[PDB]
Structures are given as C-alpha cells and as structure tokens.
Amino acid sequence: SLSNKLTLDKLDVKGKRVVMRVDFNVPMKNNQITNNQRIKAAVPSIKFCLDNGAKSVVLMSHLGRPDGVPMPDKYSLEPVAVELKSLLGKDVLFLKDCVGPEVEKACANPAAGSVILLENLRFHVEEEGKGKDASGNKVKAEPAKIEAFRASLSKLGDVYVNDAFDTAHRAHSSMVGVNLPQKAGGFLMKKELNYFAKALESPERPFLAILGGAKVADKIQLINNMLDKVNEMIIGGGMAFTFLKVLNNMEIGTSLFDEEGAKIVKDLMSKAEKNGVKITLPVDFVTADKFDENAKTGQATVASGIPAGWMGLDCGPESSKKYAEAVTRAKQIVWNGPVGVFEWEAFARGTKALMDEVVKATSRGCITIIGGGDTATCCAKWNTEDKVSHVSTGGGASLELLEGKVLPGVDALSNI
Ligand SMILES: Nc1ncnc2c1ncn2[C@@H]1O[C@H](COP(=O)(O)OP(=O)(O)O)[C@@H](O)[C@H]1O
Ligand SMILES: [Mg+2]
Ligand SMILES: [Mg+2]
C-alpha cells in the first residue's frame, strides 16, 4: 500500500508545468529565517523537475499561524524566496498571493525553467477550511469559495507533486484538493512512504520500538498499534513513571503521572504478553528538585523511589545498558520520543547515549527510523541526521501513520 503510490521519479515532467506543495514552515525571528534546513530539503525535488525539462515549478507552502487572514507583516513567505534562490542557484519569482487571476496568468505558460513561489496558503481560510477572524472567533469556510480556491491552485500546473509530509495528515486544500490527473509524492515524501512501509508492512526483525516523550494518554493508540508490529518495546521518558507507579507501586514524587493512562497500563502489558512483545522499562533515574534546566540533581532507582517534591527527568546508567541490549538485538528500530528532558544538558545523557547506540546499530546495517518532532530535533542537535537511516520530516503526521491511520494527503496521491 504505502508502497504503491506514484512518486516524482516515475512522473514524466518534460514540457509540463509542475505545481509542488512543499514544507517551507521554517522557524523565524521577526521575519529572519533562523534555520533553512526545510528549504534545503526540498531542493532535490525541485532540481529533478528542472533537470528533466519541466516548463515551470510553482511552489506552494504555509508558514506560521495566520489562521486564514492575510498577515504579510508577520508570516510572509518572501524571505524564503530569497533563501531558495541562494540554495538553488536560480532566480525565484515571488508572488504576493497564491490564487486568483493575476497568479493564474503568471503561472499559465511561463518561460521554460521558471521557479515561482506563491504567498502563504494559510492567508486564505479555504486552505485549512477554518480559521479565526480579527476578533479571534472561529470562522468556517464556505463551500463555493473552497471549490474556487482548489480550482485556482489546480490551474497552476499540469501535474501535482506533494513533498510536504508534515501536512499530509490534514485534509487541507493543497493536500487533497488539487484536481490534476497525476499526483505524485516528491523525493522527501517518497522516503517517508518507503521507511514507514518498513515500519508498518514489512519490518526486518527483531523490530524494536522506542517510545518516549511526556504524556501517556495521547500515545495509547501509538503503543497499541506498535504492539501489533514489533518484537520489543522500550517505554521511556516521562511516560515510564505511570507504568512504574502502577506495576511496581514506585514512589515517583512530582514526576509526570497520567491518571487516565494509569488505568490502561495493565491492558497494554497484557497485549504485549499476548503478542510476545518484550517490554523494557527503565530501572534508574536522574532526579531534579524542580522542572528547571539548572535544578539540583540526584539519583534514584525503581526500588529507592523518588523523593517527595523531586521528579525523574532522565534515565540512569543501568537503564541505558538495558536499552543498549535491546538496540543490539534489533535489525530495525522506530524511535518516537526522547527518553529524558533532552533540551537541558543535565537531563540529556540518556537520550544522547541511546542515540549513540542507534547510530552504531545503523553502521552495522540496522534500519533506524526516527519520528518527526522532538526526536528529530535530537538528531539535528547532535548532528546525527546523516547517521541514522531516516529522520521523518513530520511530527504529527509520522505519529498518525504509526497509529495505523490513513493520511488524507497520502491517500490523495495517484496509485501505481
Ligand atoms: N522524564 C520526563 N519528564 C518530563 N518530560 C519529559 C521526560 N522525558 C522526556 N520529556 C519530554 O518529552 C518531550 C517530548 O515528548 P513528545 O512531544 O511526546 O515527543 P515527540 O515530539 O518526539 O513525539 C520533550 O519536551 C521532553 O523534555
Ligand atoms: Mg478543483
Ligand atoms: Mg518525535
């Protein structure tokens, strides 16, 4: 299935106008781009089109949270057009809208090899289908205007490419509303489809899931679905304290505890036993007197408990050994969620040590897949993006795939 979607390498673009949805939602500090990695990531798809004789590449994206009102002073894509030109080595024409007669005329039959970047899709309520007015009240798009917006986008190319996996979980106009005969995943999308097909359809084995992060209750369906796919699961991060309080009566102090998640811990452990999944929980911890980067630190074990007032913010050295044992056994790994508060150096050792192990595993042929969002931020922070098999470009989207969902943007792509 994820396997059988049309991708850009299989799409004839010679003489065609290409309308391409890209992820240019770059971090900003008052209109200046603080990280251009997303822009670089789209260059292979763009260059492929140009190298294979595309008449034009029209780029559409969003930036920030305009909520369906034009906010060009705060969330304009104009700075991205400057940065893209530098990265591509080609002129980029920036348009101050993304739909309407002037845009359509500009994109109808441009000079061959033209690269065009449109203004922020989310200045229009029709993109998301909803937004907020100037009073901050919810507005709903009108069907006739959604149809018009979609029809306008559809005029801007002869074929469609979606290289914006980070939005593919949303049934937005630019994801599902472009009415062209061929709709292909770009090269970023292709890597997401391929690697998550390994995670979901045909894993190498033993297959290990490393599930960390903060909250349990938002990860129930993720854990549940992964328990149908994996042979081993590490449960780490803040989630672990709910499991340990329930199963061991551990004293956890002020560590994160999920009162709803607590009521399904035994249900998940039961499913793991039923499917033969080996669960690895942490056994030791770095503690902190408060949730702060420069908190006083201590140590604890499951047996010692955590003192009243104190929280467990990372795993300890014996946990790291047990985690490394599981990684050593694995031929495929999916990792969603850091195993400690990686943002702060005092509480990053567990996540860094585990990253080191996943990198070593990759070196001897382990297929290693990092989910988007905070686990991906870890790879960027320690320069390991090139040393694991795959770092997903979409946090929410990777999580929804791993839950077992059909992503509307993926489903909209042409088959075969
Ligand atoms: N022991 C812990 N206590 C509190 N927060 C934690 C702990 N371990 C990890 N975290 C936090 O988990 C967050 C990431 O979790 P999550 O958002 O679920 O990850 P992802 O974006 O990878 O899905 C980070 O902000 C990190 O600081
Ligand atoms: Mg249409
Ligand atoms: Mg993540």
Author numbering: 1 to 416
Which statements did the authors publish about this structure?
Phosphoglycerate kinase 1 (PGK1) is an ubiquitous enzyme expressed in all somatic cells that plays a central role in glycolysis where it provides energy in form of ATP through the reversible phosphotransfer reaction from 1,3-bisphosphoglycerate (1,3-BPG) to MgADP in order to produce 3-phosphoglycerate (3-PG) and MgATP in the presence of free magnesium. PGK1 is a monomeric enzyme of 417 amino acids formed by two distinct α-helical domains of equal size, the N- and C-terminal domains connected by a hinge region. The N-terminal domain binds 3-PG or 1,3-BPG while the C-terminal domain binds MgADP or MgATP. Two different crystallographic conformations of PGK1 have been already identified: the partially closed conformation, able to bind substrates, and the closed conformation, the catalytically competent state.
